[PDB]
Amino acid sequence: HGYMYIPSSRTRLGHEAGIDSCPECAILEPVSSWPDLDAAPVGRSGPCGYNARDSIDYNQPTTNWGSDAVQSYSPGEEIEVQWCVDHNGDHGGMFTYRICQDQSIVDKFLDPSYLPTNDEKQAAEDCFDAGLLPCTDVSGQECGYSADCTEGEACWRNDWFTCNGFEASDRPKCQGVDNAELNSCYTSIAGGYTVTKKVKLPEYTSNHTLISFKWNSFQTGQIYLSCADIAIQ
Ligand SMILES: *[C@@H]1O[C@H](CO)[C@@H](O)[C@H](O)[C@H]1NC(C)=O
Ligand SMILES: [Cu+2]
Ligand SMILES: [Zn+2]
Ligand SMILES: [Zn+2]
Ligand SMILES: [Zn+2]
Ligand SMILES: [Zn+2]
């Protein structure tokens, strides 16, 4: 149970708007999330998430999210990206952030009068994958391999970020990464912990595009997807 926190995602804004009672509850399941991180289709969840708790499809804007960029950044900027894990739903695993570079695909997620089809959602996922923001593109960031993977498996990749070992790495699981305090970010079930990294943006400008967050659970056959509206200017 988790969702993208900084820049503020559609899911964060939906909670803040009184629409989403459980932002951390937006789940793609059941899926094979491990060890082949990109295998499972995204179905209804798409790159922005679907929350079955209150039946919210974040892939299309509403009066409460998706109309405009929440934050503007510069081309090639190394930016802070943060997600929030609930105290009772820290499943370990690996996560990543992506920007789809095809504005024509992105634009299908920016129209309040249009709901993308499941095919469109998968096409977008494939574009996001081609635009993954590698951990190792940030100068000085340490990009480890997962304690829950072995060499050469499909999970053995440090473009993605990893949570700590589900034994610990001292500081087990996702919460161990920042080792932050409880309620450092909002979750509804048991209170949230931050999970904070940097990514390097691409070098083109756009007035309105999307970062999509994807977290592949280790403990469970679940994927957590969110997206944030951003500008690169
Ligand atoms: C954003 O849109 C405004 C108004 O059309 C334009 O002046 C500006 O150049 C655009 N920015 C981009 C394309 O990064
Ligand atoms: Cu969970
Ligand atoms: Zn609140
Ligand atoms: Zn993918
Ligand atoms: Zn694969
Ligand atoms: Zn190093």
Author numbering: 1 to 233
What does the paper say about this structure?
To provide structural insight into the AA13 fold, the AA13 gene was expressed from A. oryzae, which encodes a protein naturally devoid of a CBM. The structure of this domain (GI:317149073) was solved using the single-wavelength anomalous dispersion method. The refined 1.5 Å Cu-loaded structure of Ao(AA13) has the same overall topology as AA9, AA10 and AA11 LPMOs featuring a conserved central β-sandwich core (Supplementary Discussion). Copper coordination is provided by the terminal NH2 (Cu-N, 2.2 Å) and the π-N of the side chain of the N-terminal histidine (Cu-N, 1.9 Å), which is again observed to be τ-N methylated, similar to other fungal LPMOs expressed in filamentous hosts334. The endogenous coordination sphere is completed by the τ-N of a further histidine side chain (His91, Cu-N 2.0 Å) and a tyrosine (Tyr224, Cu-O 2.5 Å), both of which are invariant across the AA13 sequence family. The copper ion appears to be in the photoreduced copper(I) state, as previously reported for an AA10 member of Bacillus amyloliquefaciens and for an AA10 member of Enterococcus faecalis. In contrast to the flatter binding surfaces seen in AA9–AA11 enzymes, Ao(AA13) displays a shallow groove along the protein surface that leads directly through the copper active site. This depression likely accommodates better the profile of a polysaccharide chain within the more contoured surface of a retrograded starch or possibly a single glucan chain (see Supplementary Discussion), as compared with the flat crystalline surfaces of β-linked polysaccharides with which LPMOs AA9–AA11 interact. The structural elements of the surface groove of Ao(AA13) are derived from the residues in the regions in the long loop preceding β2, the loop between β2 and β3, the long loop preceding β4 and the loop between β5 and β6. The 3D structure of AA13 shows that it shares the same histidine brace active-site structure as previous LPMOs and that the extra conserved histidine, commented on by Vu et al. in their solution phase studies, is not part of the copper’s coordination sphere in the solid state structure described here.
